[model samples]
Target: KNVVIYADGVYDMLHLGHMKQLEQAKKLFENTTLIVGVTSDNETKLFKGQVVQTLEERTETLKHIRWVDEIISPCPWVVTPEFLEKYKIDYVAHDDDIYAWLKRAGKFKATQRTEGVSTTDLIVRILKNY
Candidate 1:
């Protein structure tokens, strides 16, 4: 039986923090499958006001990462048990401050939230430098 670990995120501006989280997720199990669920642009804008990258772009970027085994672009931000079962996910890994709904659903493993950088900061830095 294969173990599949799911990690969901907006993944706007690809950054080292994102890389670290995925790396940690992959380290959870020696023979684990790490799937990253990238939120849709519309959904991302609905919450974050702006989306630095489209769903397709984010998918392409995350796919290039060696740690990522699979991707589910435009996956619902609100994770449900059905979603997990549908994807054949054995466990879901996320940051310490996962969505309240995810916590309520009770199917998530916490990973380290990399300090010192975030999408917002990355975007701001890009704009400042540009």
Candidate 2:
């Protein structure tokens, strides 16, 4: 049986932090299959409260990354059952239950929340400093 690990993100700016995370995530599994589900520009704007870059640009940036095996379009607002079946996915690694019900059902694997700044926070820092 193949052990598939899945992760998703908007990945606004391709930075060293993003690269490090992907590298670390890929190494967690032997036969690493990295599937990136980048959020749509409109959706990002609505939820993240801003638009950093267009969806097409994100596609180009993410697709070429060596660690990523595949890219899905119009990524899910929630981790659906269909996504699990379609990807033949065995595991998912993410932050805290952005969706509570999904976590309770053991449908996805979420990492424990730790102390760290996020991309949004990083952006804010940059703006404040500049």
Candidate 3:
């Protein structure tokens, strides 16, 4: 069976960091099926301000990426066991180090977070210049 790796993000104004994470997920296993989970606007809005890109737009952006094998939109911020079973995910990739349960269970795949760049920073740059 193929190794299915899961990674989730807001992906608003997706940048190199986002792509790097996906690339890492893609290479996690020799035969990795990289699944990208995009968080919904409702959940994102509750925390971060409104995203510049809509859910449809964000998902569309990822669809063009070669590293992504599948895309799941409106994914839960909290990854659940049911979700894992449904997708048959062998491992979950993340840089935030929040998946304590998965980590302890040895089902988490930790990737290096790309530094010195992000969507919010890009927004700030544009705002500062304009």
Candidate 4:
């Protein structure tokens, strides 16, 4: 079976850093089956606050990324064994400092995050310019 790699994000701004991270996930294994978990706007709003697009819209955004093999929407903030099993996720990839339980359990992997780019930064720049 191809390795079912998992990555999650809100992707409010849909920028390059996000693509690069997903690209890394795509190539994480020679036979990578990338399944991106786009956190639902409902969940993001409650935890991360505000969203530029609806959950379905955000999920649709990743559809154009060639490296992404599958998409999971309405993903949970607190990832659990049940969730992983539901998706058959081999490892959850991110920049670390997140998903401590999975990382500690060896069910998680990490990709180095790109700097100087983010949705939050974009907001700050917009406000400063305006």
lDDT tens per residue, model 2, 43-86 = 78887767667888877888778888877766875677678888
**lDDT against true structure, model 1:** 0.83
After TM-score superposition, what is the CA distance of residue 89 in candidate 3 from its true location, in Å? 0.5
lDDT of 4 by residue, 74-97 (tens): 777777789888888888888775
Model 3 earns a TM-score of: 0.86
**Candidate 1 lDDT, tens digit per residue, 1-130?**
5679999998877888989999999878779999899998887888867876778888888978989999888789788778888998877898874456666766567888776697677678889999
Which candidate should be chosen as best, given TM-score against the real structure? Answer: 3
* Residue 116 local lDDT, model 2: 41
Best by lDDT: 3
The positional error of residue 30 in candidate 3, measured at the CA in angstroms, is 0.4
Q: Which ten residues in a row have the lowest lDDT in candidate 2?
A: 108-117
Instruction: Spell out the clash pairs found in candidate 3.
Output: none
Report how far off residue 64 is in candidate 2 (Å).
2.4
The TM-scores of all predictions, comma-separated, are 0.81, 0.74, 0.86, 0.84
- Per-residue CA lDDT of candidate 3, range 23-98, in tens? 9999988898999999999889887678888999999999888899999897888898888999999999988545
CA RMSD for every model? 3.2, 3.5, 2.3, 2.6
Count backbone clashes in candidate 2: 0
Between candidates 3 and 4, name the one with more favorable TM-score.
3
